[PDB]
Protein backbone atom coordinates (compact mmCIF):
# COMPACT_ATOMS: atom_id res chain seq x y z
CA UNK A 1 0.00 0.00 0.00
CA UNK A 2 1.19 3.50 -0.75
CA UNK A 3 -0.11 5.78 2.05
CA UNK A 4 -0.89 9.40 1.63
CA UNK A 5 1.09 11.69 3.94
CA UNK A 6 -1.88 12.52 6.27
CA UNK A 7 -3.28 9.11 6.02
CA UNK A 8 -0.02 7.64 7.35
CA UNK A 9 0.21 10.35 10.06
CA UNK A 10 -3.26 9.27 11.27
CA UNK A 11 -2.41 5.64 11.35
CA UNK A 12 0.85 6.32 13.18
CA UNK A 13 -0.97 8.49 15.75
CA UNK A 14 -3.60 5.85 16.33
CA UNK A 15 -0.90 3.26 17.01
CA UNK A 16 0.70 5.55 19.57
CA UNK A 17 3.84 6.63 17.70
CA UNK A 18 3.24 10.28 18.11
CA UNK A 19 5.65 11.57 20.81
CA UNK A 20 6.86 8.09 21.42
CA UNK A 21 10.29 8.30 23.09
CA UNK A 22 9.82 12.04 22.68
CA UNK A 23 9.68 12.04 18.86
CA UNK A 24 6.84 14.10 17.46
CA UNK A 25 4.68 12.73 14.67
CA UNK A 26 6.35 14.67 11.98
CA UNK A 27 9.66 12.95 12.77
CA UNK A 28 8.00 9.57 12.04
CA UNK A 29 6.32 10.78 8.86
CA UNK A 30 9.54 12.33 7.60
CA UNK A 31 11.39 9.09 8.29
CA UNK A 32 8.81 7.08 6.39
CA UNK A 33 8.90 9.45 3.49
CA UNK A 34 12.65 9.09 2.99
CA UNK A 35 12.84 5.40 3.93
CA UNK A 36 10.00 4.06 1.79
CA UNK A 37 8.19 6.93 0.06
CA UNK A 38 5.23 5.80 2.12
CA UNK A 39 5.09 2.35 0.41
CA UNK A 40 4.58 -0.54 2.77
CA UNK A 41 6.04 -2.93 0.14
CA UNK A 42 9.42 -1.18 -0.02
CA UNK A 43 12.49 -3.45 0.33
CA UNK A 44 16.18 -2.71 0.16
CA UNK A 45 19.04 -5.18 0.17
CA UNK A 46 22.04 -4.07 2.15
CA UNK A 47 25.65 -4.74 1.40
CA UNK A 48 25.93 -7.15 4.24
CA UNK A 49 23.08 -9.33 2.83
CA UNK A 50 20.47 -8.11 5.34
CA UNK A 51 17.29 -6.52 3.96
CA UNK A 52 15.20 -3.52 5.04
CA UNK A 53 11.42 -3.95 4.95
CA UNK A 54 8.36 -1.78 4.91
CA UNK A 55 7.39 1.83 5.58
CA UNK A 56 10.22 2.35 8.03
CA UNK A 57 12.77 0.06 6.32
CA UNK A 58 13.32 -2.13 9.36
CA UNK A 59 16.33 -4.36 9.08
CA UNK A 60 16.61 -8.13 9.28
CA UNK A 61 20.00 -8.06 11.03
CA UNK A 62 18.26 -7.45 14.34
CA UNK A 63 14.63 -6.95 14.13
CA UNK A 64 12.77 -9.52 11.99
CA UNK A 65 13.23 -13.01 10.53
CA UNK A 66 13.64 -13.49 6.79
CA UNK A 67 15.63 -16.80 6.94
CA UNK A 68 18.43 -15.35 4.83
CA UNK A 69 20.42 -13.11 7.11
CA UNK A 70 23.09 -15.36 8.79
CA UNK A 71 23.80 -14.62 12.32
CA UNK A 72 20.82 -12.22 12.76
CA UNK A 73 18.32 -11.81 15.41
CA UNK A 74 14.49 -11.37 15.34
CA UNK A 75 13.96 -9.00 18.26
CA UNK A 76 10.44 -7.95 17.13
CA UNK A 77 9.45 -11.66 16.91
CA UNK A 78 7.95 -11.38 13.42
CA UNK A 79 8.57 -12.55 9.90
CA UNK A 80 9.98 -9.64 7.91
CA UNK A 81 7.05 -10.09 5.58
CA UNK A 82 4.79 -8.75 8.31
CA UNK A 83 6.46 -5.41 7.78
CA UNK A 84 5.15 -5.24 4.19
CA UNK A 85 1.47 -5.42 5.14
CA UNK A 86 -1.03 -2.77 4.31
CA UNK A 87 -1.71 -2.66 8.05
CA UNK A 88 1.20 -0.84 9.79
CA UNK A 89 0.71 -2.39 13.19
CA UNK A 90 3.73 -4.66 12.96
CA UNK A 91 5.96 -1.93 11.65
CA UNK A 92 4.89 0.49 14.47
CA UNK A 93 5.30 -2.02 17.20
CA UNK A 94 8.72 -2.90 15.96
CA UNK A 95 9.73 0.73 15.50
CA UNK A 96 8.90 1.33 19.15
CA UNK A 97 11.49 -1.31 20.08
CA UNK A 98 14.06 0.13 17.72
CA UNK A 99 13.73 3.74 18.90
CA UNK A 100 14.04 2.50 22.51
CA UNK A 101 17.34 0.71 21.87
CA UNK A 102 19.69 3.64 22.95
CA UNK A 103 20.15 5.84 19.84
CA UNK A 104 16.68 7.12 19.43
CA UNK A 105 15.76 7.81 15.83
CA UNK A 106 19.44 7.81 14.80
CA UNK A 107 18.79 4.07 14.22
CA UNK A 108 17.29 5.24 10.93
CA UNK A 109 20.30 6.74 9.01
CA UNK A 110 17.94 8.45 6.69
CA UNK A 111 16.19 10.18 9.62
CA UNK A 112 19.54 11.39 10.83
CA UNK A 113 20.64 12.61 7.41
CA UNK A 114 17.39 14.03 6.13
CA UNK A 115 14.95 14.71 8.98
CA UNK A 116 16.93 15.45 12.17
CA UNK A 117 17.06 19.16 12.85
CA UNK A 118 14.73 20.08 10.05
CA UNK A 119 11.20 21.51 10.18
CA UNK A 120 9.55 18.10 10.66
CA UNK A 121 6.18 19.64 11.61
CA UNK A 122 5.75 20.40 7.97
CA UNK A 123 5.14 16.71 7.38
CA UNK A 124 1.89 16.85 9.39
CA UNK A 125 0.85 20.43 8.32
CA UNK A 126 -2.77 20.37 7.16
CA UNK A 127 -3.61 16.99 8.48
CA UNK A 128 -6.75 16.64 10.37
CA UNK A 129 -5.24 14.96 13.41
CL1 LIG B 1 5.80 17.25 14.33
CL1 LIG C 1 18.08 -15.52 9.14
CL1 LIG D 1 16.27 10.27 22.08
NA1 LIG E 1 16.80 -11.62 11.37
Swiss-Prot record:
Annotated localization: Secreted
Keyword Disulfide bond: yes
CDD domains listed in its UniProt record: LYZ_C (cd16897)
Disulfide bonds: 6-127, 30-115, 64-80, 76-94
SUPFAM superfamilies: Lysozyme-like (SSF53955)
Keyword Disulfide bond appears in the UniProt entry: yes
Annotated GO MF terms: beta-N-acetylglucosaminidase activity; identical protein binding; lysozyme activity
GO biological process, one term: cell wall macromolecule catabolic process
Taxonomy, superkingdom: Eukaryota
Extra information: Lysozyme C is capable of both hydrolysis and transglycosylation; it also shows a slight esterase activity. It acts rapidly on both peptide-substituted and unsubstituted peptidoglycan, and slowly on chitin oligosaccharides.
Quaternary structure and interacting proteins, as annotated: Monomer.
Family that this chain belongs to: Belongs to the glycosyl hydrolase 22 family.
Designated name of the protein: Lysozyme C
Amino acid sequence: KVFGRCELAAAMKRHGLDNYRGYSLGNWVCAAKFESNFNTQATNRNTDGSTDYGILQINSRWWCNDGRTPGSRNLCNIPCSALLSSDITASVNCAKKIVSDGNGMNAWVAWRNRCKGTDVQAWIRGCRL
